[PDB]
């Protein structure tokens, strides 16, 4: 990929001065299209209630689950509404989960408890559930189909159940010369060390073209874009924040000089709290708004970068699922989120969102080629396949303040390589 090509030449720099030194040029970004328009909210009227969201979620997700239960259990179909069930008869039900957990805090670290019930709910009534089903892997808000019978105590006995699955995916055109994309998250400007300072300096010095030989300068010239994904100012306590926007403005100036940059709000960043987070206001960045290479987006970000389509968050859905479930692997939680056809199924019950009423926008309408996450504690990447011809690369971006690691994504081979930065510390090997 990158470090293979970075040694492909001769080395000139352990030498006395010369007449000329080589220069290069940044590769063109001749196609780009932002398609994150359902997350940019222009009107923003509150004063509705959260019942309009669940109803449109069920009404939109129902035909997918009917069409999958047909070909997953046989076209001798027995799909039936929750009220028209007769005692001890084999049928399929399509509904919404609700997990009834105590230890979840009310108004007046994991939170799973050894006893907690699942309830299948439709628009008119509910029913309890027991049998062969996982009690702690599933969360409230998933829509699914299920197979079984109504027993004598009013409960329901489950044999097997199925999720919605992956959406269709059109193929991408192949590329001629490999272009790279760099992904960073969580610089933590405001607190978090001094080795993080030299790490941030060495990272911007490599990507801008100040560091290393003609190998590194030829290979960093091919990096086409830069994406910064959330949690730019890590905060120690709210009640500091004014002096940090000055330094963030300086860093975005030093990056806006050479590359195009995309900046996203995070868990602590001066924006709203609900989930389609709106872009940062330009009045906090005097210096960096001189150039038209800096762009400010928000939370859920879609794009079409050179044919390859991207979609990502700053890691607020994945940690929310991590709170109220039993899965630990963040790459697994990201793939599970992909499997139920919903970016954030736990919303709104433990993760706040805007009260939409026309259409729920967190249902996947297509399949992305790349799908990344936000502030995960360690690097990971994987390739997964669909039932049809659908392949997806899954990346979890590490957190720069502890690991000092970023990710390079190739746009022609579609692979991801880590990059790590480490200056020497107070290290003396004679003690």
């Amino acid at each position: 990929m990158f470090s293979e090509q970075a040694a492909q030449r001769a080395h000139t720099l352990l030498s006395p001065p010369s007449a000329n030194n080589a220069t290069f040029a940044r590769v063109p970004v001749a196609t780009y299209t932002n398609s994150s328009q359902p997350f940019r909210l222009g009107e923003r009227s509150f004063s509705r209630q959260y019942a309009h969201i669940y109803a449109t979620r069920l009404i939109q997700m129902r035909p997918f689950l009917e069409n999958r239960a047909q070909q997953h259990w046989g076209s001798g179909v027995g799909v039936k509404k929750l009220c028209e069930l007769q005692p001890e008869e084999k049928c399929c039900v399509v509904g919404t989960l609700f997990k009834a957990m105590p230890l979840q805090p009310s108004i007046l670290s994991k939170y799973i408890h050894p006893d907690d019930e699942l309830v299948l709910e439709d628009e008119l009534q509910r029913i309890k559930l027991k049998g062969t089903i996982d009690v702690s892997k599933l969360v409230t808000g998933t829509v699914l189909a299920v197979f079984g019978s109504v027993r004598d105590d009013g409960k329901f006995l489950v044999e097997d159940y199925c999720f919605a699955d992956l959406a269709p995916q059109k193929p991408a055109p192949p590329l001629d010369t490999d272009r790279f994309v760099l992904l960073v998250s969580g610089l933590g400007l405001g607190g978090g060390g001094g080795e993080s300072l030299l790490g941030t300096q060495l990272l911007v010095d490599v990507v801008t073209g100040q560091l290393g030989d003609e190998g590194e300068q030829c290979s960093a010239a091919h990096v086409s874009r830069v994406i910064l994904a959330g949690n730019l100012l890590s905060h120690s306590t709210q009640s500091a924040s004014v002096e940090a926007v000055k330094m963030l403005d300086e860093i975005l100036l030093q990056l806006s000089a050479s590359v195009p940059v995309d900046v996203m709000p995070g868990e602590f960043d001066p924006t709203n709290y609900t989930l389609p987070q709106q872009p940062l206001h330009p009045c906090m960045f005097p210096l960096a708004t001189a150039y038209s290479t800096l762009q400010l987006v928000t939370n859920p970000y879609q794009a079409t970068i050179d044919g390859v389509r991207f979609l990502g968050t700053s890691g607020q859905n994945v940690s929310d699922i991590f709170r109220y479930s039993s899965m630990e692997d963040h790459l697994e939680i990201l793939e599970w989120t992909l499997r139920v056809r919903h970016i954030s199924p736990t919303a709104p019950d433990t993760l706040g969102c805007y009260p939409f009423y026309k259409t729920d926008p967190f249902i996947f309408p297509e399949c992305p080629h790349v799908y990344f996450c936000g502030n995960t504690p360690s690097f990971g990447s994987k390739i997964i396949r669909g039932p049809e011809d659908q392949t997806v690369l899954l990346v979890t971006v590490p957190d720069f303040s502890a690991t000092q690691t970023a990710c390079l994504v190739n746009l022609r081979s579609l692979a991801c390589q880590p990059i790590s930065f480490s200056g020497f510390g107070a290290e003396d090997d004679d003690l």
Binding site: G42, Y50, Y54, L58, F98, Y273, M284, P348, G352
Partner: protein, 107 residues
């Protein structure tokens, strides 16, 4: 009586001086504006977090997640504490539209 014939202009967010035009900042306190935007968006952020914890608690006290809430229980603190945050949010959202929009929306 006279109290209705107000509005059409708002006072400076920095030093409370009534003036003609709709801009939020005063001409003497125009420089310090990034700090005055920084201040009060951490208030909108904390009102947003209080709307959502309350209006979904009624859904769990009611039983259903798919139908409307009707409970005007005068002995519940939940009622009329869920009524005032709508207006706090209504007011604090409109104070930040004094500042322009952070981008376009018709693209």
């Amino acid at each position: 009586g006279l109290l209705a014939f107000a509005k059409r202009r708002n006072c400076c967010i920095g030093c409370r001086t009534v003036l003609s035009h709709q801009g939020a900042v005063c001409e003497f306190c125009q420089p310090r504006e990034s700090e005055l935007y920084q201040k009060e968006v951490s208030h909108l952020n904390a009102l947003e977090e209080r709307f959502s914890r309350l209006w979904t608690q009624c859904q769990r006290c009611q039983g259903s997640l798919h139908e409307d809430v009707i409970c005007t229980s005068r002995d519940c603190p939940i009622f009329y504490m869920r009524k005032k945050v709508r207006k706090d949010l209504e007011d604090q959202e409109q104070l930040l539209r004094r500042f322009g929009p952070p981008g376009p929306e018709a693209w």
